[PDB]
Amino acid sequence: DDDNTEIIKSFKNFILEFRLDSQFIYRDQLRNNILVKNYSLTVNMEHLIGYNEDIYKKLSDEPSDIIPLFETAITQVAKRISILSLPTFQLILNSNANQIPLRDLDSEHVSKIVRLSGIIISTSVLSSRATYLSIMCRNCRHTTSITINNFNVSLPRSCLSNCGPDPYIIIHESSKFIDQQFLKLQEIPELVPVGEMPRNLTMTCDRYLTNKVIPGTRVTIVGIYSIYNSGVAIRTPYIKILGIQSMFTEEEEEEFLQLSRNPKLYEILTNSIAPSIFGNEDIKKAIVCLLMGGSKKILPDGMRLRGDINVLLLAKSQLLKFVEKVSPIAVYTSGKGSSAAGLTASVQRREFYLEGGAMVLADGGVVCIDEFDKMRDEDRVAIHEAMEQQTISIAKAGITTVLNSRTSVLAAANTTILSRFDMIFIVKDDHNEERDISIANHVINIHTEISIEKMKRYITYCRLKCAPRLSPQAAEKLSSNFVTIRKQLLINPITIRQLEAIIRITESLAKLELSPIAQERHVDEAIRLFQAS
Amino acid sequence: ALVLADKGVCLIDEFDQDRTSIHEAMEQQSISISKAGIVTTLQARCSIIAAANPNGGRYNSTLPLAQNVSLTEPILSRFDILCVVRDLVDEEADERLATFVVDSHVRSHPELQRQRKKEEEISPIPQELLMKYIHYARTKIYPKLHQMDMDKVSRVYADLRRESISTGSFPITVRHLESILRIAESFAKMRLSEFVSSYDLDRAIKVVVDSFVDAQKVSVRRQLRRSFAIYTLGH
Amino acid sequence: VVIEAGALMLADNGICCIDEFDKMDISDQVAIHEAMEQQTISIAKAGIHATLNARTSILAAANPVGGRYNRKLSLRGNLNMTAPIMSRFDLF
Amino acid sequence: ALSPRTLTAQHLNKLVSVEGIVTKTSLVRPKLIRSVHYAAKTGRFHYRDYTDATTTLTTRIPTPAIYPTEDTEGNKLTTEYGYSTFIDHQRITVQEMPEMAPAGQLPRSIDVILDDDLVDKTKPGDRVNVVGVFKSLGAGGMNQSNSNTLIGFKTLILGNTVYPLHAARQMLTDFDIRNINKLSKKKDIFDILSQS
Amino acid sequence: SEIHVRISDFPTIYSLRELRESNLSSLVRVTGVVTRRTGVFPQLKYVKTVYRNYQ
Numbered sequence A: 001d002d003d004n005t006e007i008i009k010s011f012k013n014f015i016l017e018f019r020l021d022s023q024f025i026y027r028d029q030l031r032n033n034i035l036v037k038n039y040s041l042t043v044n045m046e047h048l049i050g051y052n053e054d055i056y057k058k059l060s061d062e063p064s065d066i067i068p069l070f071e072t073a074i075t076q077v078a079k080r081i082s083i084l085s086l087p088t089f090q091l092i093l094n095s096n097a098n099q100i101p102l103r104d105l106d107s108e109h110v111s112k113i114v115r116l117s118g119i120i121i122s123t124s125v126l127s128s129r130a131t132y133l134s135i136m137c138r139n140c141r142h143t144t145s146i147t148i149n150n151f152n153v154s155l156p157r158s159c160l161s162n163c164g165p166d167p168y169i170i171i172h173e174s175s176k177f178i179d180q181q182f183l184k185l186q187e188i189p190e191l192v193p194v195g196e197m198p199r200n201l202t203m204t205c206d207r208y209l210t211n212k213v214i215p216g217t218r219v220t221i222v223g224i225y226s227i228y229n230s231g232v233a234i235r236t237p238y239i240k241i242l243g244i245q246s247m248f249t250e251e252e253e254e255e256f257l258q259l260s261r262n263p264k265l266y267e268i269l270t271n272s273i274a275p276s277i278f279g280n281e282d283i284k285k286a287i288v289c290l291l292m293g294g295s296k297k298i299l300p301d302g303m304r305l306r307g308d309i310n311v312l313l314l315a316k317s318q319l320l321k322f323v324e325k326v327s328p329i330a331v332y333t334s335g336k337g338s339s340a341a342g343l344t345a346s347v348q349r350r351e352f353y354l355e356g357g358a359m360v361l362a363d364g365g366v367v368c369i370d371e372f373d374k375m376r377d378e379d380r381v382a383i384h385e386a387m388e389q390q391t392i393s394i395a396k397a398g399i400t401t402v403l404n405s406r407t408s409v410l411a412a413a414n415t416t417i418l419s420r421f422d423m424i425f426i427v428k429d430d431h432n433e434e435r436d437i438s439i440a441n442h443v444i445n446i447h448t449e450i451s452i453e454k455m456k457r458y459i460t461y462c463r464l465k466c467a468p469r470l471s472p473q474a475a476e477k478l479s480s481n482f483v484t485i486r487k488q489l490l491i492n493p494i495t496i497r498q499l500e501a502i503i504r505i506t507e508s509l510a511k512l513e514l515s516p517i518a519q520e521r522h523v524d525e526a527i528r529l530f531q532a533s
Numbered sequence B: 001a002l003v004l005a006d007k008g009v010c011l012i013d014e015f016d017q018d019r020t021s022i023h024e025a026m027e028q029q030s031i032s033i034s035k036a037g038i039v040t041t042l043q044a045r046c047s048i049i050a051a052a053n054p055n056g057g058r059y060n061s062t063l064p065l066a067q068n069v070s071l072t073e074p075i076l077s078r079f080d081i082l083c084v085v086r087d088l089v090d091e092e093a094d095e096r097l098a099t100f101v102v103d104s105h106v107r108s109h110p111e112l113q114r115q116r117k118k119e120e121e122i123s124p125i126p127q128e129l130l131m132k133y134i135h136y137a138r139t140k141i142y143p144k145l146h147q148m149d150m151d152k153v154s155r156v157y158a159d160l161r162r163e164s165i166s167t168g169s170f171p172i173t174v175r176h177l178e179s180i181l182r183i184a185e186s187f188a189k190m191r192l193s194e195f196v197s198s199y200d201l202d203r204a205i206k207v208v209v210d211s212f213v214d215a216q217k218v219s220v221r222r223q224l225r226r227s228f229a230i231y232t233l234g235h
Numbered sequence C: 001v002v003i004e005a006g007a008l009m010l011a012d013n014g015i016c017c018i019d020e021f022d023k024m025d026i027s028d029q030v031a032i033h034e035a036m037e038q039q040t041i042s043i044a045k046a047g048i049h050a051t052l053n054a055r056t057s058i059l060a061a062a063n064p065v066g067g068r069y070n071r072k073l074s075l076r077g078n079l080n081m082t083a084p085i086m087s088r089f090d091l092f
Numbered sequence D: 001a002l003s004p005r006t007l008t009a010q011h012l013n014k015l016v017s018v019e020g021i022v023t024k025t026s027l028v029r030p031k032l033i034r035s036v037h038y039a040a041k042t043g044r045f046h047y048r049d050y051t052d053a054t055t056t057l058t059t060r061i062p063t064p065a066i067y068p069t070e071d072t073e074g075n076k077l078t079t080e081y082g083y084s085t086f087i088d089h090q091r092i093t094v095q096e097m098p099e100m101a102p103a104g105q106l107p108r109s110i111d112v113i114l115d116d117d118l119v120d121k122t123k124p125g126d127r128v129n130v131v132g133v134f135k136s137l138g139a140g141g142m143n144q145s146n147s148n149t150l151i152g153f154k155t156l157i158l159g160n161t162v163y164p165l166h167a168a169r170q171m172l173t174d175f176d177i178r179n180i181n182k183l184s185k186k187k188d189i190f191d192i193l194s195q196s
Numbered sequence E: 001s002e003i004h005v006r007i008s009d010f011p012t013i014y015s016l017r018e019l020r021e022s023n024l025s026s027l028v029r030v031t032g033v034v035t036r037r038t039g040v041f042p043q044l045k046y047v048k049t050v051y052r053n054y055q
């Protein structure tokens, strides 16, 4: 009976006295945690060992029994430093003991503190556990209460105030609860023996350790290794977790502004795109315009005006990979697609369902297609709606839904389908032996102007900050050029759907300078670059 | 089944989802999958040897490789060595084959010295020693390139690209160069040599260039072999 | 699965007779082809794996396409049978 | 004011408001709360009441749903349907809107209880805002079970009020009627409306 | 705390055909292919507590 008091006294004196140099680090941490309504304490094992090794020995022998005592000691200290009501505090641990590989845990480790690491592969939803709980006695209508703690309980049968064999029920109207969550840990990929599928474990956490990690992240874990009921005399193992380890600044935008006022920025950005590829100036310019894009607009009568850009390319393999790397968001695919959804979408079967291809998935970003001619039959017709409307709509087999397809498409191949694109060009080649020799020398080196990341961040900044408008002079220029070309064709087609593309190219060109208005300088370069032919 | 092939050899004797799995397998060296919220990864890390029947009953030599297969271009691009084997007509070859076949058939009949004579006539190396040798070489030997002759390799690569473009052939690529260097390392490993040598590069160049030539149409084949004589036969 | 033996298992070290082979579905012709290639049968499903021996010789009957043989054409043209299966009969 | 993702154990027994999409609806069922009986000999009408955990905010001993057949004084009883009282009951499920789902993660949802007037005012696919008391239920495995009590308690929202969300209809005010009638007497209303 | 003796080269062999009721509680030597394998679990050793591995 007295041992429960001495241990609590010992941990209470541990928190109140541990200085390293001049700061009571744990008194300060426990005060600073309460002010932000965080009821927990993060103790370090090495400091506990340094203070008194006997306390660590007791903790190491019987963790399941001794952890609650230290927690209630934390509560007793927490009340003194902040009151002249609080819940029970959560203890959290850090350690540097030798990691056990997940594959080696066995019957020798049951009810021991264990440190391991792996990859999280799944996460459950949150669930409720009880800590303080009230009880009603059915016969006499007497009432009492119980305090649960979550370490390895059932309702009692010692009736009070005969009173009967099993008279107790719960008043949920006057009880307290906490959160709980389940996780799955899979062993590290570079530790598995050859020819075997990786092994995994299941584990639990509660209160502040919940909702701290997501699937696919590599983590390190400290926790008690134990068993639970779910052959003969055989039980399942698991782990109780006690600890886990896993927009612009001003100085950034100053650099981007300095770039914006450079008189030769357009040349600089074109030169920075696929520098190994020789020639093909207008291709690089068109890719800059594709990356930057126009400006979206919405009108009083509800009509909606597109912002995206679309380009086709008729060597060519490299540029799509570069566009994938430089773009803020990017998807890469070949014409047949990743599944039966193809590029756009399809219905599959047993009840029917629907899944989207690599036009729905790239919504909000860029998508590049490696061979546009290998497009499937359904996608040939569906890309019309995917490009013009930026939507995909299906009414089949009782399904009736519409999907968003807001993206800019880059494509390459080697007909009427060319009408959907804003610009079309044909790739050109040159055959200097020095170029091939340089490439070969670089290949042997691995076998034996603006950088990508800076350019990507700059593109993000320009997309976020500016959305320019046409000046009146540009309007007069464009309308005169439009009627001029149509008259020239008449005496010898251009249509409104291409004028509205020239406008988007003009806005994208004005976007680089961060000029709020587009000007005749941009209109001239726009119509100059319009010569797809 | 690629998990079971980890650091081993994968064998395919005949041939959409299977091909899709093989596309991902050749593109990567690791396999990844997700299901009902779960996410996980696996390793393939293996050599793939495959065989196929050329689009029905018989191969057509007048046409390029793509006409004779049910494969996408990246498959042919990413494999190191490609080859076609055909039942050619020759009286002497037929006689040699028939004599060897009946001789082996008699040699296998159910009805120590006999075994030793049989074994030593069968092969020049005892295959137990060869298997141990292969295991030893795979575990111990890790060759490296020598930097002198690589200037010549770059010049040969540029020349091959120029000649390919000149006749209008599909061009040679960095994949072919990488395959040449890797095959040269394999030749060095086969004799337990930690150094690649000029003859290794020559043999690798011959293998890859001949494989590249076999994929082409007949007129392109004739032009290539007439120009490439200083590689396929000479060096 | 029910595992219970099929016809080819009962004909182990025996003669298996197939009548009107040409009416068999391709999806089952391939199964007979796979068994005939190896003289072996494999099962792997529902956590149960098994391998079995099928040293059986096959005797087959078939109809020419259109019901009457065409002397103008090869046997491949007359018969609705895929080439790998046709390659594995000793005698026609 | 919350959403299904963020509803947390701290909020139990509080009055909360949630927003989401209806995904499932149960069939409507009747529920007994009171029964009336006529004693054959004495001519006296008797009655009794019933309770269940979802019927009351406060907690009471559950009732066995048995009809009494015999009086305290031994008289045989008869049940008077039509004088007894039954009420309607329906359960639904509400899920967080897909626009708020993070990182392609699994979405989360809550079950709601409706009764009396609130029944059948929603269908699947409706965007809806629900007001009610957030409460727990059951023994949670502390009544003896094989789980070692790792499983948690069950929880619900008891529907107090339901409002739709517009994501079509409008209701006119008097000024709209005046303007609509006045505009109709222009000479060329058809041209104005068509060109608009 | 405890050591196990492993016996080797037992001089008689059965397949899974020849086993009969007379073999019960006798030592046997058997060969075959492993078709299926469970995961490893702990098992209570004595019926203070001790465990052992099981499969």
Ligand SMILES: [Zn+2]
Residues within 6 Å of the ligand: A137, A139, A140, A141, A142, A159, A160, A161, A163
């Ligand atoms: Zn009592």
